[PDB]
């Protein structure tokens, strides 16, 4: 009873409640199970583990992540997170709750059905409404006009809008995000020397990539420098004390976005692909859209990229257009916070699919009710 506010995207859980102005808690969407036998069963640690408590204990366990179109899903034991996430981390089962939900476009049709078959026939939530997560950033930021080029950890989009009318032929889905970097990123530096790494260490290649790396500002001459130079070394210390001298690395992968051709790819650059996408975007407001961009979304704190984009946007920009590109604080959190603005609206509660509607349409309501 009442409704609740969170981020449920492929990266971090960012759980909170309605009437806050940040998530209550921010943590990884990890779960899994002892592939290494917990032999002395009950030996001060679990039979299966989640999030932080799995990460605190990780090596015993095979630990999971869910999605790619026609190449990854797991659907069921998403439960295994959820119910504890709820009846412990929300400290309630959503079986009680009028409820906020979110999704993304062009899932398999049946995706919506597995969701809803769970929501009702499993979790028995009374009433609820699904939406696009970017709407909450827009609840916060209030823009009419712009393209939300974005990456999470686990998904990418462009989102053109104009004066209402978020563009249904020009808003985009792509699987690639903050995820896929670390894999390539691992491949090299037994070159640097570090002959000692796997998945369980890909862990820290998730990490330093985000703690201190920035997107290169003009990577060509940063590498013309590196090909002769050693001044860059904001280095890292291995687990109990070896400083791996490091710090030119701290931007070196970040051309791969402008050049998926690095990874051999049939894809043009990020910017090229977005300029191509602008041909699918409206013909007219290609005037406007330069003067029309401000930060929100989890990645939006990241260094070296924002100028690089404004600069590359500029390097492809027309005359008669002003290249407004701006980064307000807490941009990383404005989806959670926008969800707590949305929680003010009794009409969004009038927007609920009731469990009743998943009975009285039969199941069949979902592709013809939620946002």
């Amino acid at each position: 009873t009442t409704a609740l506010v969170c981020d449920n995207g492929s990266g971090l859980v960012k759980a909170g409640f309605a009437g806050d102005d940040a998530p209550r808690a921010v943590f990884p969407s990890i779960v899994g199970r002892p592939r290494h036998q917990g032999v002395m069963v009950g030996m001060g640690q679990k039979d299966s583990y989640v999030g932080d408590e799995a990460q605190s204990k990780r090596g015993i366990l095979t630990l999971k992540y869910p999605i790619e179109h026609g190449i990854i899903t797991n659907w069921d034991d998403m439960e295994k997170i959820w119910h504890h996430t709820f009846y412990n981390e929300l400290r309630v089962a959503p079986e009680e709750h009028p409820t906020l939900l979110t999704e993304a476009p062009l899932n398999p049709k049946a995706n919506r059905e597995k969701m809803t078959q769970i929501m009702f026939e499993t979790f028995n939530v009374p009433a609820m409404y699904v939406a696009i997560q970017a709407v909450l950033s827009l609840y916060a930021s209030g823009r009419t006009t712009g393209i939300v080029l974005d990456s999470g950890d686990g998904v990418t989009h462009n989102v053109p809008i104009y004066e209402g009318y978020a563009l249904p032929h020009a808003i985009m889905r792509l699987d690639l995000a903050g995820r896929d970097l670390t894999d390539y990123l691992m491949k090299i530096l037994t070159e640097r020397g570090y002959s000692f790494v796997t998945t369980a260490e890909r862990e820290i290649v998730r990490d330093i990539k985000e703690k201190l790396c920035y997107v290169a500002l003009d990577f060509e001459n940063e590498m013309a420098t590196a090909a002769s130079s050693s001044s860059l070394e904001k280095s890292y210390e291995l687990p109990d004390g070896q400083v791996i001298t490091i710090g030119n690395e701290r931007f070196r992968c970040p051309e791969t976005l402008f050049q998926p051709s690095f990874i051999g790819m049939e894809s043009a650059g990020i910017h090229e692909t977005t300029y191509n996408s602008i041909m699918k975007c409206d013909i007219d407001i290609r005037k406007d859209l330069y003067a029309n961009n401000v930060m929100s979304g989890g990645t939006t704190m990241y260094p070296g990229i924002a100028d690089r984009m404004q600069k590359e946007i500029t390097a492809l920009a027309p005359s008669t257009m002003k290249i407004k590109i701006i980064a307000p604080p807490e941009r990383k959190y404005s989806v959670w916070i926008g969800g707590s603005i949305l929680a003010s609206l009794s009409t969004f509660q009038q927007m609920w699919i009731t469990k009743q509607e998943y009975d009285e349409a039969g199941p069949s309501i979902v592709h013809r009710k939620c946002f």
């Binding site: 290494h36 390539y184 491949k187 070159e191 002959s195 051999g264």
Partner: protein
Amino acid sequence: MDSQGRKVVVCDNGTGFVKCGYAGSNFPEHIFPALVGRPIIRSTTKVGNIEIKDLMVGDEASELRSMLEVNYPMENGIVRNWDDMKHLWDYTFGPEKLNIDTRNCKILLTEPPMNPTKNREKIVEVMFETYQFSGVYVAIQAVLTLYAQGLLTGVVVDSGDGVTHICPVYEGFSLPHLTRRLDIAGRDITRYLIKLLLLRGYAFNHSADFETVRMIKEKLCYVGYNIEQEQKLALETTVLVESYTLPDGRIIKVGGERFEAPEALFQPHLINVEGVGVAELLFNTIQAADIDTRSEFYKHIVLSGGSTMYPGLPSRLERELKQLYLERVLKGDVEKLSKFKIRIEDPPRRKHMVFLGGAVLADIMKDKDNFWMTRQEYQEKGVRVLE
């Protein structure tokens, strides 16, 4: 070719053996274990009186065990010394392994993918402080398989004692951001396998003994094919077990571990260090492989070395790879499982192709400074030695 059969050489810098000779020799015309050692202690007794030699390399080091401090200063079959290698090189130039000199001459060798090459470069600079060839060639280790036949596609695949490799290939391009290998073969399998034998009471000191598994592993070992029916049979029958004279005399008694040690390939969690093993990696590899490539790969993927002259495991793999397919991907369609034509891909020539894979390039390349990298391009401080 355009000059004598001498003065150019080909060599496998292999982890079990070195296999080497003048370029286009019939085999790698000398072969020796990749061994070295220089004196220490073994006897505890008044025997031997030998006089004849101190240090040894390879085929002459064989007899000696701890009479030499033997070494392989290594990780992943990639060395971490510069110098005993030198004393080996210095040995090899004799009829010892080669009967050669080098400045006047040229040579064909290989490089690890992600060799941290600064060390190759230092060695090469030493080689060009010493052996100093008029020209040289080096290429990524797996590439030289496709040479006796001029091949272009599949995955390129290797194993032995020290390492294993898994190179996805099309139009001769390996797919690099996509490439695989596995960083071991029979060596630490012998550590695990000999751990089984302690428990039988065969608690024997490794330091003098581990490489006994090598004798049988080289001379005598195999894989079955029926293998799940073979698991059923093995404990129910019991009488399907084996034994052999350790040639000091001792017949010691030995079960399925002879070729159940291979199960740690396909279930590394055998060693508790987890794994779905190489056959799941292969599934993942071909899941990544695209529609056409994966479909061709029902009869279009490539193998190498003496470590592929191996019974029954190929048969068990296709027996197996009809499954995960049907299971996970056909999700119960079956009607084409043979109509996916399937013909085998590891021939008798995989024996000699350890060096004859390389030799069929020299057969078209000895006249080509189009191909020859050089001592000059080292002497330049040139960014690499190569045309």
